[PDB]
């Protein structure tokens, strides 16, 4: 008789009783677990069984050990995109869960997100979230991430520069990439930076917060990296 | 030495008795010391027996509780608190347990932390017998004589935690529900099961802060109650279709299932844990020689109740086991084989998760 | 713990002391018989003063107040609770008795004595249905202890529960007899025999029919007891010709008597003469033919 036969077996009689007994139902995954330890499917059921008890800290725990056991299944990757949709009560509870598994876990689990996303603005906005939830991160994807929606919107072809890549950039892709002191930056990016800026504001308020403060902030800070609106 | 008892006896009972105490502390400091391992010799026995109503054994109790707290020494407290209490097999070891049982009782009312971990210690060295006679008074006094009573007793499950371990061990020594009275009280289980659940490390706190002995003393309290706990959750199923209320059936089932799962969750922890002091694979916390008197009883209990009666609760207690004995060698809590699985279970009645456990 | 720690030293170091310890037996296992003892000398104060005024006031409250927490101690947990209080009721009212109708009105007159029996007979209410014995047997030992200053406590506990009280009380007097009192039973039995004859009487007939040390001196003891209790022994001359008619109870009688000496079948019958003399009042002829 095959395994799989009795890895099957469990799962059906473990779920047979959830709706009966909450913990004979998690003692049984727990037993087959101590049996077939390397199963996905009976770990994948414990995870759900506690995330639908709500239980951040044994869902977290579980949760963490398939995305480091069972990388290759579909369902985790759709779980962490639930997540990361969450990121970007239930969304709460995610966020929550999302936190219970380790930082570096979880600046992990947002780089396989990162290798797995195909539309460049989905990618840019939760490269832009990776950053801001790790700041650390922002030394090695904020350029680039600035560049990227550069790119991507001279490809687009955008007749008008007011575009969601440009905006993006100049709006929180730039000033991390500016104030972030372990970025080191030559000083012909610092033009282009106030370009795409200028750009930015002029094309915004001739047709948000203050782009006009965001702008002059801009500009300071490369003026003193190179080194009211009358005195000066 | 003789002076101060011709001293001693012209002072009345209180105050020979702290007079004794306060010499024998002297005595105690001073060897300690001198020597780092001390000998608790005749004189201070005597002294203890000899001048150590109900009101002045109130004002004793009191200011004896004020000693162990005001002591801040933990070897000389704890040293002090096994002399008077470690059994001596003398008469006055009944005694001894009745006194020990007002003195922890009234230190759990108060939360005498420092009485706390005493007991804990005191307990871990003490044969089983005085152990299941002190847990008798004090699950007495916090659960059936004033009832809800436990609830300050339940508070010690986090205040002297090291002392709730070894509560639970001698207690599931005692209530090893070998009979409906060794059955521990409802109030009592649900202390427990609330402790534990709170705490699965809360059984695994003397593991993890003693040095162990590659034997554990025999007919003394074992290093962790997770043998009589997973007695108590396992022959739990059994003893209550024996007692008979329908409501309060289905309540212990339930704190019982809860006390299993928390058991179980100690056992998968304690697969690291063992690893983590280098004793999986070597010290078997859940001795098998502890777990052959609960499979055995449960192979009794199931002969008995005509199974064609108590099918669910045989089958019930049946998965229980095999779940407690394949969790505790996978987490190497028990050491055993597979074939040791098979030859255990040979004369049981048919189970399905236990011939998978055999099997593997 | 803090607040507590200063109840149990305040109660250390009367009504206020007495509401500290009523408040610690309600709050702390082991120190119930510390509550208890002080709340002894709370009912003989209570019963000096009664007995002051009578040979001739804020205690009576603490009297009740401690009657109240050791009676919801009684319904809280009848089996631990019951027989600790009901043996310290017991062992309470003895103690005031030491230091038999005019007896009963004189100390159901003092309030401290009622509420102690009203205490111990609420333990029996509760324990009658399981088990009264442990109550029952401390009630005997008490009056044991304190005759015939507690015979009036017994005779009234037969007046409220003749079932159980009198064949105790016959039992007792029959190992007094069998070891050597007497006197203390006679005078429970003729109280109680103004008001449960009719149980006293098949009490008594069950115990010499199952006579039919102890079972040989059974009808010795019963014979001193005619002699001493005349009013038994007229409650029992109403049926003693029909208890004793069928030969075969009278072989049984005969040898049992001739199991003794004849220094002894003369004393039994002289003693048999004794009572048929001084015995029958209306069934005379009938015994006599």
Same mark, same amino acid.
């Given at each position: ?99 219970? #598994? &380790? ?6 689990? $947002?780089? =396989?997100?990162? /290798?797995?996303?195909? *539309?460049?603005?989905? @990618? ?60 080191? #930056? &030559? ?6 930076? $106030?370009? =795409?800026?200028? /750009?930015?504001?002029? *094309?915004?308020?001739? @047709? ?25 | ?360 | ?289």
């Amino acid at each position: 008789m095959s395994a799989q036969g009795d890895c099957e077996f469990l799962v059906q009689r473990a779920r047979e009783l959830v709706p009966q007994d909450l913990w004979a139902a998690k003692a049984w995954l727990i037993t087959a677990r101590s049996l077939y330890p390397a199963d996905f499917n009976i770990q994948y059921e414990m995870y759900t069984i506690e995330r639908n008890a709500e239980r951040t800290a044994t869902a977290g725990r579980l949760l963490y050990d398939m995305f480091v056991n069972f990388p290759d299944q579909p369902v985790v990757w759709r779980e962490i995109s639930i997540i990361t949709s969450a990121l970007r009560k239930q969304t709460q509870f995610l966020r929550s869960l999302f936190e219970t #598994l &380790p930082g570096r876990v979880q600046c992990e689990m $947002l780089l =396989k997100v990162t /290798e797995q996303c195909f *539309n460049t603005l989905e @990618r840019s906005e939760m490269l832009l979230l990776l950053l801001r939830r790790f700041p650390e991160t922002v030394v090695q994807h904020g350029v680039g991430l600035g560049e990227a929606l550069l790119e991507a919107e001279t490809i687009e072809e955008q007749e008008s520069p007011v575009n969601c890549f440009r905006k993006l950039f100049v709006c929180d892709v730039l000033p991390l990439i500016i104030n972030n002191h372990d970025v080191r #930056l &030559p000083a012909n990016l610092l033009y282009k930076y $106030l370009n =795409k800026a200028a /750009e930015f504001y002029i *094309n915004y308020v001739t @047709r948000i917060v203050d782009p006009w403060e965001r702008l002059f902030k801009i500009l300071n800070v490369v003026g003193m990296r190179c080194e009211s609106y009358g005195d000066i | 030495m003789s002076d101060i008892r011709h001293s001693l006896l012209r002072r009345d009972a209180l105050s020979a008795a702290k007079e004794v105490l306060y010499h024998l502390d002297i005595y105690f400091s001073s060897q300690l010391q001198s020597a780092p391992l001390p000998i608790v010799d005749k004189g201070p026995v005597e002294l203890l027996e000899e001048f150590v109503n109900s009101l002045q054994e109130l004002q004793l109790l009191e200011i004896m509780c004020n000693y162990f707290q005001e002591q801040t020494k933990d070897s000389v407290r704890q040293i002090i608190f096994s002399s008077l209490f470690s059994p001596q097999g003398n008469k006055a070891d009944d005694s001894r347990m009745s006194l020990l049982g007002k003195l922890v009782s009234m230190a759990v009312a108060v939360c005498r932390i420092p009485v706390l971990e005493c007991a804990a210690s005191w307990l871990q060295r003490t044969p089983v017998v005085y152990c299941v006679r002190l847990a008798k008074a004090l699950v007495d006094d916090y659960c059936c004589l004033v009832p809800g009573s436990i609830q300050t007793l339940k508070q010690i499950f986090s205040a002297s935690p090291r002392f709730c371990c070894q509560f639970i061990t001698s207690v599931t020594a005692l209530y090893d529900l070998s009979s409906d009275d060794l059955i521990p009280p409802m109030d009592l289980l649900e202390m427990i099961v609330t402790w534990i659940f709170e705490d699965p490390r809360l059984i695994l706190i003397t593991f993890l802060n003693t040095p162990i002995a590659a034997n554990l003393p025999i007919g003394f309290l074992e290093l962790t109650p997770l043998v009589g706990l997973i007695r108590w959750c396992v022959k739990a199923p059994l003893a209550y279709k024996r007692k008979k209320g329908v409501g309060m059936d289905r309540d212990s089932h339930l704190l019982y299932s809860k006390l299993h799962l928390s058991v179980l969750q100690v056992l998968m922890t304690l697969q690291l844990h063992l690893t983590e002091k280098n004793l999986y694979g070597r010290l078997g916390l859940i001795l098998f020689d502890h777990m052959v008197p609960l499979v055995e009883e449960i192979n009794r209990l199931a002969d008995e109740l005509n199974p064609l009666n108590a099918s669910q609760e045989i089958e019930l207690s049946l998965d229980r086991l095999a779940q407690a004995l394949q969790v505790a060698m996978a987490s190497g809590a028990l050491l055993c084989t597979r074939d040791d699985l098979r030859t255990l279970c040979s004369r049981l009645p048919h189970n399905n998760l236990l011939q998978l456990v055999i099997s593997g | 713990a803090q607040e507590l720690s200063q109840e149990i030293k305040a109660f250390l170091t009367a009504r206020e002391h007495a509401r500290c310890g009523l408040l610690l037996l309600r709050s702390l296992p082991p120190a119930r018989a510390a509550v208890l003892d002080h709340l002894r000398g709370v009912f003989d104060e209570s019963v000096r003063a009664h007995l002051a005024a009578l040979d001739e006031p804020g205690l009576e409250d603490v009297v009740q107040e401690v009657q109240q927490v050791l009676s919801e101690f009684i319904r809280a947990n009848p089996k631990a609770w019951a027989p600790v209080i009901s043996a310290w009721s017991i062992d309470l009212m003895g103690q005031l008795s030491s230091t038999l109708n005019e007896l009963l009105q004189l100390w159901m007159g003092c309030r401290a004595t009622r509420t102690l029996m009203d205490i111990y007979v609420q333990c029996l209410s509760a324990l009658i249905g399981s088990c009264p014995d442990a109550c029952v047997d401390a009630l005997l030992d008490t009056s044991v202890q304190h005759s015939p200053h507690f015979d009036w406590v017994v005779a009234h506990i037969g007046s409220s529960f003749p079932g159980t009280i009198i064949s105790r009380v016959l039992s007792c007097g029959l190992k007094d007899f069998c070891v050597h009192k007497i006197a203390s039973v006679v005078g429970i039995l003729g109280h109680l025999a103004s008001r449960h004859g009719d149980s006293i009487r098949r009490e008594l007939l069950r115990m010499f029919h199952d006579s039919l040390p102890s079972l040989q001196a059974t009808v010795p003891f019963l014979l001193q007891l005619a002699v001493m209790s005349p009013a038994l022994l007229g409650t029992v001359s109403g049926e003693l010709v029909d208890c004793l008619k069928p030969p075969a109870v009278l072989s049984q009688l005969q040898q049992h008597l001739q199991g003794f000496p004849r220094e002894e079948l003369d004393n039994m019958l002289n003693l048999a003469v004794h009572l048929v003399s001084q015995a029958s009042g209306a069934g005379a002829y009938r015994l006599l033919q």
